[model samples]
Target: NPPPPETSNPNKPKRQTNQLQYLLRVVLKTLWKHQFAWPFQQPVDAVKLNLPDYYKIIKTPMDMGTIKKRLENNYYWNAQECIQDFNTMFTNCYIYNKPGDDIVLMAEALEKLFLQKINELP
Candidate 1:
């Protein structure tokens, strides 16, 4: 980048992407630290969890660990994409597990928190 553009921070890249990534990382940290978010910390194990139809129902499986890598890798270009996966992750849980199931209940709590945080972002 040309300094003639009057860039103040030479070390930081274009501010928008860096800022968006930073914001997403903050939200991810919160989700990772949440107690109710345990179930989504890792990808679901179909065989181990006895979810025979899990993959069939959840065409696109999303998990916190994967999102972490994706975000760090710069695979995502915007906050909306991050929200897409977060919602997909929780929606998958809801689809496979019964509404009364503990996993679904926890997912609901996690989803609410995710939505709240993302909605507040400008």
Candidate 2:
């Protein structure tokens, strides 16, 4: 397990280390813009993105563990399970609250859960 980024290799070059950060920023921006557009109306439009291409922008290293946890927590019964659960869970629960403060609370809880899991990993 690698140490937290801050504590790793003090001699590592700054630009190289920061390159991944820049790529991450670009991917995040693209995702923020296109997330809601994944489920297109036309079959051809949907086929263009495919499942992997559509979700690729949000596919962070952290998301690997997240995907596993989501699968486990949902008690997926077989290896044949599609990522439909991920798509459904995010689409349905991403907006846990609306026109109210419940949204804030829900987001806070979700953030806490993610942070806890992330920190537990290497």
Candidate 3:
């Protein structure tokens, strides 16, 4: 199990609704591993970065155990950041990029929401 999360500094601005929304959206985007050749069979291309191929390219030190460990850490951190909503909604043990919402669209919306909120602040 992971150690308890570090405490936030008191002097920093208290987290607001917009900041939480931005963080959740960021997590969603990182989880979005969309690529070509999904739901299809094709030879892996050097330029076309699919999910499995992306993992293949990033394997430096090249051991499956280390690679799996790093991926698991990323999944844990992201879910930790969004633990409340995740506990309420996520049904599967696996982490997944929600298929219906495209990453680009969600990112754009989040950016817009962030700027709007910041504009409201002093």
Candidate 4:
């Protein structure tokens, strides 16, 4: 090579971090593939979903694609940070949806399912 590429880095993620990253992928696969994950597959649509004030109550919106992007870009240093997006996603739904609303109900179950699967790991 005639010149050093700035893209080439000496500080790659450690073997332990590789495990955490891989583990994060595993958990996300479960969440994005879940039955009730349809609504959360992408960012919320306030106009379509009729949520005019959604952005007002919830800021820093997050979604599955964003979550995956963050993981793919190595933006997260730990699995907890990865899961934090899911927490925010679900919390946003809860805040925007009434307690007994259908989306809220599904959010509850999906949140539970994520918790269940996440706990299955060490």
User: Which 10-residue span in candidate 3 carries the lowest summed lDDT?
Assistant: 36-45
Model 2, which residues run further than 4 Å from truth? 1-96
Give the clashing residue pairs of candidate 1, or none: none
Ranking by TM-score: 1, 4, 3, 2
Order of models, best lDDT first: 1, 4, 3, 2
Give candidate 4 regions above 4 Å deviation. Answer: 1-19, 120-122
User: RMSD per prediction, one decimal?
Assistant: 10.3, 17.0, 14.3, 8.2
Give the winner by TM-score: 1
- TM, every model: 0.78, 0.22, 0.23, 0.76
lDDT of 3 by residue, 65-100 (tens): 222232333422332333433222222111233444
Which of the predicted structures, 1 or 4, would earn the higher TM-score when compared with the native? 1
lDDT by residue for model 2 over 1-122, one digit each (tens)?
21111212335422222323322343223332442423211121224435444333332112223333333233333322313432333433344224336534443444444334333221
Clashes of each: 0, 0, 0, 0
> In model 4, how many backbone clashes occur?
0
Which residue pairs in candidate 2 collide? none
Per-model CA lDDT versus the true structure = 0.72, 0.32, 0.32, 0.71
Model 1: per-residue Cα lDDT over 6-115, one tens digit each: 21333434323753675556788888899987788878877777767777777778888777766665666576766787888888887777998999889888888877
